[PDB]
Write a protein that binds this ligand. Structure first.
Ligand SMILES: CC(=O)SCCNC(=O)CCNC(=O)[C@H](O)C(C)(C)COP(=O)(O)OP(=O)(O)OC[C@H]1O[C@@H](n2cnc3c(N)ncnc32)[C@H](O)[C@@H]1OP(=O)(O)O
Ligand SMILES: CC(=O)SCCNC(=O)CCNC(=O)[C@H](O)C(C)(C)COP(=O)(O)OP(=O)(O)OC[C@H]1O[C@@H](n2cnc3c(N)ncnc32)[C@H](O)[C@@H]1OP(=O)(O)O
Ligand SMILES: CC(=O)SCCNC(=O)CCNC(=O)[C@H](O)C(C)(C)COP(=O)(O)OP(=O)(O)OC[C@H]1O[C@@H](n2cnc3c(N)ncnc32)[C@H](O)[C@@H]1OP(=O)(O)O
Ligand SMILES: CC(=O)SCCNC(=O)CCNC(=O)[C@H](O)C(C)(C)COP(=O)(O)OP(=O)(O)OC[C@H]1O[C@@H](n2cnc3c(N)ncnc32)[C@H](O)[C@@H]1OP(=O)(O)O
Ligand SMILES: CC(=O)SCCNC(=O)CCNC(=O)[C@H](O)C(C)(C)COP(=O)(O)OP(=O)(O)OC[C@H]1O[C@@H](n2cnc3c(N)ncnc32)[C@H](O)[C@@H]1OP(=O)(O)O
Lengths: 346, 152, 346
């Protein structure tokens, strides 16, 4: 009965339904999502679908004339009324410059450099999100991840005891896996891996699914020097930081995601029923695994979602498509609604 | 050298090999893995000038011809790579295990290459069908090696 | 007779007269110098004097409007016929974008990022200098040295067997010293120090002065492990590269610039008559020494000058004054005329 409604496409539909429910609860208010890639073709082609679906309220960035010309040439009539904002022409541009200079005065950014930086749409979008002018931002559709996420980490920052991480959802036919940091940290330590696992567990728990973390490696409970030792230590630290969870490591991917292999080979492990949160030892493994699963595997992956930052702020992979942008914007609108509701409870 | 061995194995099956040196960056050549993969691609191209070897790149860029053509038309790899070389052990191991488990595509292996005689090691988490496939390919490699030895 | 006419009172005048003579011998064509900071008060204030002295022909960068408004506010009547160009609206903007995408495609920049980078005034000025549309460029008066010089090295680059390196002239009453390098290299090795010494010697010999090189250190011919050994090796390498030169090291700062101390304590050294070019171990030593000599010393310094680049491109220090800017632009005009003459002769 209930086992025949797995999150293949029901996951994104349920996310859209939850976005609509949250909007209806808060007086029919659509979260304002800033797109610094105003002139990007894929961004606008996904924005047409998003505004048709009544998900978010776009705020494009750039010169209004060029953005309007691009919209007209690309034949999108739904985007004829969008708050196109020029970063330099905004009334609050100087306040944003002053705030950025005050944040990073002792980090190589004085008034002149801050004024130069705030002309960059990424920095202005980060300031809009941080200063409450918007609820979230979506960037990185036309630039690499590093230079598109650096403004977010420099401006919005990360909350206390929080490490930024790239979280991906692999929606299989019956259960959805969560891939841990895929975008930010090169070689996270044991404590960093434990924190990433805790953030992923929180995100999974937001969706009503019990999280079962697994620290991936190339060895099955070997504890050898290097990656296996780091993953075993990270599992121990995560268990210490959250003793009510099913965290186990180290292990291989098949052992983690297959209950039968783990039960037959390693019955001593505390991970029962398979893992839905997978944490990777480094950046190469996570990135390559998630991209390969996206391309050659028929399972649909969505992301990467930036976690650990104070406010809602997302970076699309430059390799994405229109559907990927739509899914990422839906989930960033959901996260922005959650953060706005949490901020309005104090 | 790993790319050359994999290219020989692919050519044994009558398929033109297209080699991609995977990374987390797209032709960035930055410090760390991207520079190592760029140098590896250059060395492999030098060793076998007639091959289609490119790097560094990401997995989706490598295995999707449309993505590579749309984003990076300067690259010398066209039609999508069929040989993938991973920066380290963790990446390759985790990727192949995850593709085997959660994907719907069959994965056969791992096959030990670079050894003088045919000798394969099965993963401890294998199934009966996996052992059957591995033994079939081990028999193929053993016959090839025996024929090569007899020819000499 | 020659004692009463020293560098500290005649050097800048001789440089200006050489600019005038080179312009006259080439048909009265001033060098086209592109200024990325079109809306900088110091840049415009020095440009007034430069146009009055017909040293160069300025090409300001930025939107023609804000630059014109700044000129009107600062009340410079001469800077009304000057060329103000917008990087995005130039007729050759897309050719520059294609060139940058072609020469940096495998270094992390594609068309989507090349178009964004060419919007920056620094990158546009560097590309203009590289493609021959401007003779040289003078930037860095509003931002720090690193971000001002990064586009220069990325676009213009270095010539064969060349290394980027700062170069400052300390004009004393009787002679002028040449400190190198003060801006780029954090901790150059022996080979890099020898190459910097060779470049400094070439620049000194351009001014009709025999160069005497000294590899500065904290030890006097000690050869101890660390910096002294590095400078001893660098002096040996530089001597091998240019046998006809007078290169000595390692030595302290006072031994190098005082012939009496050298002739009294270490007569064996091959440096006789005092050094006029000084090579420093690391960046901290050279930067601090030149800035302290500029501030608390009574000897005027001019620079820093970016040597080792294919084309003429200088970066001012952000803590400069109008006189520093005009001196640097004069010497940039000299270097640009030399580069243009060498390119035309080929
Ligand atoms: C989907 C895809 O395409 S994934 C692509 C693969 N991923 C990548 O290419 C990016 C890999 N990651 C990176 O390069 C780095 O994590 C980047 C993006 C942060 C580079 O920025 P860096 O050079 O490391 O740092 P930078 O000096 O610019 O500072 C950025 C800020 O991030 C913060 N930061 C970075 N990593 C962390 C971390 N793990 N924990 C906490 N803070 C962090 C720094 O504290 C800094 O803030 P501060 O200036 O207030 O101190
Ligand atoms: C739903 C999903 O899919 S993901 C689910 C999980 N995601 C999460 O992000 C987890 C939830 N965590 C959070 O939302 C974050 O921890 C945040 C946003 C609450 C923390 O933001 P912070 O600014 O670090 O919160 P903090 O606890 O310091 O409170 C900020 C305080 O600064 C005060 N403040 C005053 N001026 C300002 C200002 N200009 N800006 C910010 N705060 C201000 C606020 O009043 C508040 O004090 P208060 O509690 O007395 O009202
Ligand atoms: C999918 C498929 O069907 S596989 C398709 C592709 N397959 C391949 O490319 C297979 C590659 N391998 C081979 O072809 C074979 O290993 C061969 C034919 C090259 C044999 O390798 P060889 O080293 O030539 O084997 P051979 O038995 O002739 O031994 C000669 C060398 O081995 C060395 N050797 C012999 N015994 C040993 C030993 N026990 N330990 C180490 N070296 C040894 C000898 O010293 C000699 O080296 P030398 O010539 O430098 O002095
Ligand atoms: C007066 C003053 O203000 S002095 C202030 C003190 N000085 C400073 O702070 C600047 C010191 N230097 C630095 O910080 C850096 O080394 C910089 C700015 C020169 C650039 O270093 P990075 O930012 O890591 O350089 P990046 O990776 O962007 O590469 C830029 C280019 O410079 C080149 N480069 C940098 N240093 C050198 C060098 N010593 N020799 C040759 N080439 C060099 C690189 O090869 C690269 O070219 P490529 O793109 O073709 O490979
Ligand atoms: C005055 C003072 O105070 S400083 C005095 C000391 N100064 C110096 O010593 C500066 C020395 N530097 C120089 O003379 C110059 O910068 C040079 C000669 C090193 C650079 O010249 P280059 O740009 O390398 O090339 P140049 O234009 O002279 O020669 C043409 C060649 O450039 C090649 N080239 C490559 N890229 C380019 C390009 N972007 N633009 C033009 N030519 C290019 C062409 O292929 C051509 O080669 P070819 O004729 O064999 O087919």
């Amino acid at each position: 009965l209930e086992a025949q409604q797995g999150p293949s496409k029901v996951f994104i539909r349920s996310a859209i339904n939850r976005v609509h429910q949250n909007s209806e609860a808060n007086g029919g208010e659509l979260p304002r999502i800033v797109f610094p890639e105003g002139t990007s073709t894929k961004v606008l082609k996904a924005l047409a679908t998003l505004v048709e679906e009544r998900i978010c309220q776009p705020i494009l960035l750039g010169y209004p004339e060029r953005v309007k010309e691009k919209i007209k040439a690309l034949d999108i009539p739904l985007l004829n009324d969008v708050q196109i904002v020029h970063p330099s022409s905004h009334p609050k541009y100087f306040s944003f410059v002053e705030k950025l200079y005050s944040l990073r005065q002792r980090k190589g950014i004085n008034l002149g450099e801050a004024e130069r930086l705030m002309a960059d749409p990424n920095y202005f979008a980060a300031m809009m999100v941080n200063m409450g002018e918007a609820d979230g931002m979506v960037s990185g559709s036309s630039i690499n991840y590093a230079d598109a996420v650096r403004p977010i980490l420099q401006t919005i920052g990360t909350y206390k005891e929080g490490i930024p991480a790239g979280l991906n959802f692999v929606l299989l036919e019956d259960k959805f896996l969560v891939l841990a940091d895929t975008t930010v940290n090169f070689n996270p330590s044991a404590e960093q891996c434990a924190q990433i696992a805790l953030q992923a567990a929180k995100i999974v728990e937001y969706f009503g699914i019990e999280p079962r973390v697994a620290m991936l490696s190339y060895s099955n409970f070997s504890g050898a020097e290097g990656t296996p030792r780091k993953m075993k230590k990270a599992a121990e630290i995560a268990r210490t930081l959250r003793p009510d969870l099913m965290i186990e490591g180290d292990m291989q991917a098949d052992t983690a995601v297959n209950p039968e292999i783990m039960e037959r080979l390693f019955p001593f492990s505390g991970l029962k029923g398979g893992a839905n949160v997978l944490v990777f030892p480094n950046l190469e493994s996570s990135n390559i695994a998630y991209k390969l699963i996206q391309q050659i595997g028929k399972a649909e992956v969505i992301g990467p979602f930036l976690t650990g930052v104070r406010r809602s702020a997302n970076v699309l992979q430059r390799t994405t498509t229109v559907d990927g942008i739509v899914n990422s914007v839906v989930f960033t609108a959901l996260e922005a609604q959650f953060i706005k509701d949490a901020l309005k409870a104090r």
